[PDB]
């Protein structure tokens, strides 16, 4: 199923590109779902895609957080957050 | 916790930026593992990180492919592959 795998991945790549163009750096998870649907990602796959993007460091999305804000927020440009955190904690 | 999750993700973000700057567009999984180790990702974590990067569309990695070339190859700049494939097949 190499062809099917690649073509589905291509949609998430488009999602990554669109989050890059978007000037927002923090959006709601509902906002994120809408952008994912714009590039053709099916509803039943959005949760899985959000998890893959978080584990790959492409977004920060912390649905298990008890902080009400982080729980429903998607950070779409997390490189700045990673770099800032390692700077201020000197690690 | 949120902080450990973010700092773990930061390593995979660093891996993505190393792969972007590497002149090669196709590397062995062995070489991929080595670059990941350079940024602190252990061999114990590599399979999960590669799954997340593949599902995110950040790499193409088809280890179960029967084509002997693809099964050990990591495509580190797949954006051009996605574009070409959708173009030549007209969706």
Q: Which helix (H) or strand (E) holds A60?
A: strand A60-61
CB contact under 8 A, B49 and A65: no
Cα distances from A77 to residues A30, A44, A80, A81, B24, in angstroms, run: 17, 24, 7, 8, 25
Query: Which technique was the structure solved with, according to the deposited record?
Result: X-ray
Alpha carbons B6 and A5: distance in angstroms, whole number: 28
Q: Tokens standing for B87?
A: 């173009």
Residues of chain B contacting A36 with CB distance shorter than 8 Å: none
Alpha carbons A86 and A78: distance in angstroms, whole number: 12
Three-state DSSP at A1 gives: coil
DSSP B11-79: HHHHHHHHHHHSS-SEEEHHHHHHHHHHTT--TTTHHHHHHHHHHTTS-EE-TT-SSHHHHTEEES-TH
Residues of chain A contacting B11 with CB distance shorter than 8 Å: 57
For chain B, the structural domain boundaries read 1-91
B2 — contact with chain A (CB < 8 Å)? yes
C-beta separation of A62 from B9 below 8 A = no
């Amino acid at each position: 199923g190499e062809l099917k795998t690649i073509l589905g991945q291509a949609k998430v790549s488009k999602l990554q590109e669109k989050l890059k163009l978007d000037p927002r750096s923090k959006i709601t998870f509902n906002d994120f779902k809408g952008i994912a649907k714009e590039v053709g990602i099916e509803e039943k796959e959005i949760n899985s895609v959000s998890n893959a993007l978080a584990q790959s460091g492409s977004i920060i999305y912390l649905p298990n957080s008890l902080n009400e804000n982080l729980k429903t927020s998607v950070f779409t440009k997390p490189a700045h957050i990673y770099q800032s955190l390692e700077h201020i904690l000197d690690i």
